[PDB]
Amino acid sequence: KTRSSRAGLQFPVGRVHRLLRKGNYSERVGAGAPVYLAAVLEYLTAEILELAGNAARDNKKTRIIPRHLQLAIRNDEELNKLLGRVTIAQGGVLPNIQAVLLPKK
Amino acid sequence: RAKAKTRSSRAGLQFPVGRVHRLLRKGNYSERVGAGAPVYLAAVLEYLTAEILELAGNAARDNKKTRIIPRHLQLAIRNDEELNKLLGRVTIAQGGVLPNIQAVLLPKK
Amino acid sequence: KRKRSRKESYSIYVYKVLKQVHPDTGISSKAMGIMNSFVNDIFERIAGEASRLAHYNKRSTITSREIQTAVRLLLPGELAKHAVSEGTKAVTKYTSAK
Amino acid sequence: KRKRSRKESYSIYVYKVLKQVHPDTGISSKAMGIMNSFVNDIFERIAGEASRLAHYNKRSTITSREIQTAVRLLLPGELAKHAVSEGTKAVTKYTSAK
Amino acid sequence: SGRGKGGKGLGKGGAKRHRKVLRDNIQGITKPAIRRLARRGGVKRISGLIYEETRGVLKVFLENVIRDAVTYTEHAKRKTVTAMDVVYALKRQGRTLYGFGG
Amino acid sequence: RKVLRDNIQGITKPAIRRLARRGGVKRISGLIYEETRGVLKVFLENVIRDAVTYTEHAKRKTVTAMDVVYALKRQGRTLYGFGG
Amino acid sequence: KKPHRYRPGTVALREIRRYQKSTELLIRKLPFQRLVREIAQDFKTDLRFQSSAVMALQEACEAYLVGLFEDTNLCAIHAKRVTIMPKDIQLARRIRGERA
Amino acid sequence: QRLVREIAQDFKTDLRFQSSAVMALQEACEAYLVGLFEDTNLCAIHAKRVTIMPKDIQLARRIRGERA
Ligand SMILES: [Ca+2]
Ligand SMILES: [Ca+2]
Ligand SMILES: [Ca+2]
Ligand SMILES: [Ca+2]
Ligand SMILES: [Ca+2]
Ligand SMILES: [Cl-]
Ligand SMILES: [Cl-]
Ligand SMILES: [Cl-]
Ligand SMILES: [Cl-]
Ligand SMILES: [K+]
């Protein structure tokens, strides 16, 4: 047994629980709270890695680099919104040229 | 025993050092609160309040009014480079805006 | 009946500061509401930044030092100087008046 | 020697989730650095909102219900639905396991 | 069939607990009122396309603030939206409001 | 020299062109390189002032990546990949 | 002489001075209150509102639109027009990060 | 780097920098400028131009609430 194992989780329920208590959020921390929080961090971490891993596959690369994260996040309407005010070091920007700037055809 | 005087009075302050010390303890900011922190913070809130009331009062005098209203606070704040910055992202209920008309929109004399 | 539940506010302190600054000037109920929002706002900001400063530096205690740094980060130039001046006076006076 | 502090990080758990979703793909150190920034950001957002929820409602305890309300406020529509779903599932499974 | 097994929380399926259950009121944001708001904003001339475009924006502004207000309401187990629910909602949206509490 | 005691000139016209290119900009007024330099400098002033305030508070003589990450967060320009 | 007739723009300027001088709410209160209640139904049925809650919402709404009209106006003038248009508002909301 | 050290001097003398501190500042600046250019370009196109000009940068920063 481990709290993570009992909750079905890769993320560390115990660590998260300690961070809430010591992190000056509340006097007391209920036993569900770090389980719920770890599960959500794990869910969001999984979504990004799934998408970034596909971006890597599509570039014939076995390793995720910051660009694979940037492409995953910026081409996902909801992730892009969650991280609209976040800069990803070495991520670059999505290819995008205003129509009026392209030549006529 | 006693002949007690408030921490406010000892620090030469109008703002409640004791109330400020209790809000820091119960506000979930740190495990412990040093004895200087609420004196300092109470001082800063007093200074800033004095500054807004000085400039609101001038706006109230300027409108031939004895009582400060939301509009006086707004004029005071929006016409002061530094207060406008401190409260750049703050809406003052019943404050309105500053009289400002873009030059290009004025008729040609 | 019951006497209405206690609602703390800063309004006696705002009135006392107003009487130093403009002795012949008063304040509408709404105006005072705005003053109350203001004080609580800047409390939150300074206190929260101070919370972080201690946290970043592995310290359990918010001291007058954390407040001061918080004020330097949060208040514009001239406002920050006065504030730091008034806080430092008030601590110094407090400490010597034990 | 034997300094370098001992600095905690989520990177073993990031790798662990990565091997579930993509068992043959790895991850650069900068990319891991961004994943670690990401977890600390969202942790701080959720916990901060949860801290406020309990404070607004005069409660001493952040429970799974504060986390759940924090998540609804913080995550966009579809992301929030799934995040609530996973958190609810994990709590349910963890209580049923004692 | 519908869609969903458990909708006991929503409370939807509500009528004749006295009159209630609303109309189509966005049109009550009149062209004159929109012109008044644009006047306070220093606007001198207004395309006719502005009025419907503004109602769109006002609606999205209100959906976002109210969704978060009512979230504060539901969390506090209340049936009444308080001013503080709105003030917490607006602070979240980075639209901090003075003079209704906090 | 003037460039060493006005290092802002080391941000070259080519470097500002490359930045505007990444921002999808096609054609550039000659007046933009000076205007960009003014803007860049305000940005760094604001970020470095806050970063160095964290440095002084910690009683250090060395600005760390974290001082910069905390300053960038404060200014609403949260940065991932330097110890978030 | 004719019956008096102000040129197009003059009354507009007058209104600008009038409303920039005052702080009263410029959306009629009851229509706004219905609108609020109507939108709230999409999130939860049979909700009550404190009147100060509905007032807080209206202060926040009008302040937001007056501000967006300031930004919309700048975008019109940037394009050497005096007439605000949907694409003015849209640019203002895009650069504000309110909209993708 | 020289620009960073120069600007730091105005706030405190004899400051050292972690190399990652300077790299984090460069990452942040370039991201900020690239993004300001995206917004500057839109303002240029809004005025039926293809050429970004200082007033484009000024309007972008005014609406962003970076400048009064
Ligand atoms: Ca699973
Ligand atoms: Ca999955
Ligand atoms: Ca998704
Ligand atoms: Ca005086
Ligand atoms: Ca969505
Ligand atoms: Cl202390
Ligand atoms: Cl719990
Ligand atoms: Cl249009
Ligand atoms: Cl120009
Ligand atoms: K806290």
Angle at B23 between CA B22 and CA B24, to 5 degrees: 90
How deeply is D48 buried, as exposed, middle or buried, from its count of CB atoms within 10 A (0-12, 13-18, 19+)? middle
Q: How far apart are the first and last CA of chain H?
A: 30
Q: Taking Cα atoms as reference points, which of E95, E98, E22 lies closest to residue E61?
A: E95
* Helical ranges in E1-102 per DSSP H: 31-40, 50-75, 83-92
Domain count, chain G: 1
Give chain F's radius of gyration (CA, Å): 16
Taking the centre of ligand 8 as the mean of its atom positions, its distance from the CA of residue E51, in whole angstroms, is 12
Q: Which residues of B touch E40 (CB under 8 A)?
A: 96-97
DSSP letter string over D45-58? HHHHHHHHHHHHTT
3-state secondary structure of H14: coil
Contact criterion met (CB < 8 Å) for E14 and G45 = yes
Domain count, chain D: 1
Q: How far apart are the first and last CA of chain E?
A: 46
Taking the centre of ligand 6 as the mean of its atom positions, its distance from the CA of residue C64, in whole angstroms, is 4
Which one of H27, H42, H45 has the shortest CB-CB distance to A87? H27
Element (H, E) at B18: helix B17-26
Phi and psi torsions of A93, nearest 5°: -125, 160
CA C41/CA C45 separation, integer angstroms: 6
- The residues near D11 (Cβ < 8 Å, ≥ 6 apart) are D32, D35, D36
Q: Taking Cα atoms as reference points, which of F74, F13, F66 lies closest to residue F46?
A: F74
> Do H44 and H53 touch, CB atoms closer than 8 A?
yes
CA F20/CA F65 separation, integer angstroms: 26
**Structurally, what CATH architecture does the domain formed by B1-106 represent?**
Orthogonal Bundle (1.10)
CA C49/CA C42 separation, integer angstroms: 10
Domain assignment of residue D82, given as a range: 4-97
What sign for the dihedral angle of Cα G9, G13, G14, G19? positive
Mutate to test the interface with H, among F2, F6, F25 (most CBs of H within 10 A): F25
CA H12/CA D13 separation, integer angstroms: 40
Pairing of strands A28-29, D61-62: parallel
Residue A97 forms contact with H (CB below 8 Å): no
Q: Taking Cα atoms as reference points, which of G24, G74, D31, E65 lies closest to residue H64?
A: G74
Q: Which residues of D touch F79 (CB under 8 A)?
A: 37
* Helical ranges in C8-76 per DSSP H: 11-21, 29-56, 64-74
**CATH: 3.90.950.20, 3.40.50.20, 3.40.50.1220, 1.10.20.10. Which one for A1-102?**
1.10.20.10
Pairing of strands E96-98, B90-92: parallel
Closest residue, chain B, to C65 (C-alpha): B37
CA D94/CA A35 separation, integer angstroms: 8
Å between F49 CA and nearest CA of chain H: 7
Q: Which ligand number lies closest to the CA of residue D79?
A: 3
> Do E81 and G43 touch, CB atoms closer than 8 A?
no
Amino acid type, G39: I
Contact criterion met (CB < 8 Å) for F81 and D30 = yes
> Do A47 and A78 touch, CB atoms closer than 8 A?
no
Q: Which residues of C touch A25 (CB under 8 A)?
A: none
Which one of C57, C65, C69 has the shortest CB-CB distance to F53? C69
Q: Which residues of A touch H27 (CB under 8 A)?
A: 87, 89-90
CA H68/CA H53 separation, integer angstroms: 19
Taking the centre of ligand 7 as the mean of its atom positions, its distance from the CA of residue D63, in whole angstroms, is 3
Contact criterion met (CB < 8 Å) for A101 and F81 = no
Phi and psi torsions of G48, nearest 5°: -95, 150
CA F20/CA F24 separation, integer angstroms: 6
Q: Chains touching chain H at 3 or more Cβ pairs under 8 angstroms?
A: A, B, F, G
CA C66/CA C45 separation, integer angstroms: 12
Q: Chains touching chain B at 3 or more Cβ pairs under 8 angstroms?
A: A, C, D, E, G, H
Residue F61: Cβ within 10 Å count: 11
Taking the centre of ligand 7 as the mean of its atom positions, its distance from the CA of residue C55, in whole angstroms, is 25
Q: B8 is written with which tokens? A: 């406010």
Closest residue, chain A, to G97 (C-alpha): A84
3-state secondary structure of D70: helix
> Do C11 and C38 touch, CB atoms closer than 8 A?
no
Q: Looking only at Cα atoms, what is the longest distance across chain G?
A: 62
Task: Please give the C-alpha separations between residue D23 and each of A55, D15, D20, in angstroms, as whole numbers.
Answer: 15, 9, 6
> Do F77 and A87 touch, CB atoms closer than 8 A?
yes
Pairing of strands G83-84, E45-46: parallel
Q: C97 is written with which tokens? A: 């008046």
CA F43/CA C1 separation, integer angstroms: 60
Interruptions in chain G after residues (C–N over 2.5 Å): none
Amino acid type, C10: Y
Question: Do the domain assignments include residue G4?
Answer: no
Q: Which residues of H touch G92 (CB under 8 A)?
A: 63
> Do E38 and G69 touch, CB atoms closer than 8 A?
yes
Q: What resolution in angstroms does the PDB record give?
A: 2.7
Amino acid type, F47: V
In order of their start, the domains of chain F are 1-84 (1.10.20.10)
Mutate to test the interface with H, among G70, G74, G78 (most CBs of H within 10 A): G78
Residue with tokens 């509905």: G54
The DSSP symbol for F81 reads: S
Residue E97, strand partner residues: B91
Q: Chains touching chain E at 3 or more Cβ pairs under 8 angstroms?
A: B, C, D, G
Contact criterion met (CB < 8 Å) for D46 and A37 = yes
Angle at F36 between CA F34 and CA F40, to 5 degrees: 120
Residues E27-41 as b/e (b if ≥16 CB within 10 A, e otherwise) read ebbeeebbbbbbbbb
Å between F81 CA and nearest CA of chain D: 4
Taking the centre of ligand 3 as the mean of its atom positions, its distance from the CA of residue D79, in whole angstroms, is 6
Q: How far apart are the first and last CA of chain A?
A: 66
Residue F46 forms contact with H (CB below 8 Å): no
Q: E8 is written with which tokens? A: 């006991």
Residue B91, strand partner residues: E97
What sign for the dihedral angle of Cα E5, E7, E12, E13? positive
Q: Looking only at Cα atoms, what is the longest distance across chain E?
A: 55
Residues B58-93 as b/e (b if ≥16 CB within 10 A, e otherwise) read bbbeeeebeebbbbbbbbbbbebeebbebbeebbbb
Q: Taking Cα atoms as reference points, which of B102, E69, E83, E62 lies closest to residue G27?
A: E62
Task: Please give the C-alpha separations between residue D31 and each of A52, A66, D34, H18, in angstroms, as whole numbers.
Answer: 10, 5, 5, 20
CATH number at residue G38: 1.10.20.10
Residue H43 forms contact with G (CB below 8 Å): yes
Q: Which residues of C touch A24 (CB under 8 A)?
A: 51, 55
How deeply is C82 buried, as exposed, middle or buried, from its count of CB atoms within 10 A (0-12, 13-18, 19+)? middle
> Do C44 and D52 touch, CB atoms closer than 8 A?
no
Q: How much helix, strand and coil, in percent to the nearest 5, is found in chain F? A: 60, 10, 30
Domain ranges of chain A: 1-102
DSSP letter string over E11-37? --S---SSS------GGGS-HHHHHHH
Taking the centre of ligand 5 as the mean of its atom positions, its distance from the CA of residue B81, in whole angstroms, is 38
Q: Taking Cα atoms as reference points, which of B15, F41, B81 lies closest to residue C78?
A: B81
Contact criterion met (CB < 8 Å) for G97 and A85 = yes
Closest residue, chain F, to H3 (C-alpha): F7
CA A34/CA A30 separation, integer angstroms: 8
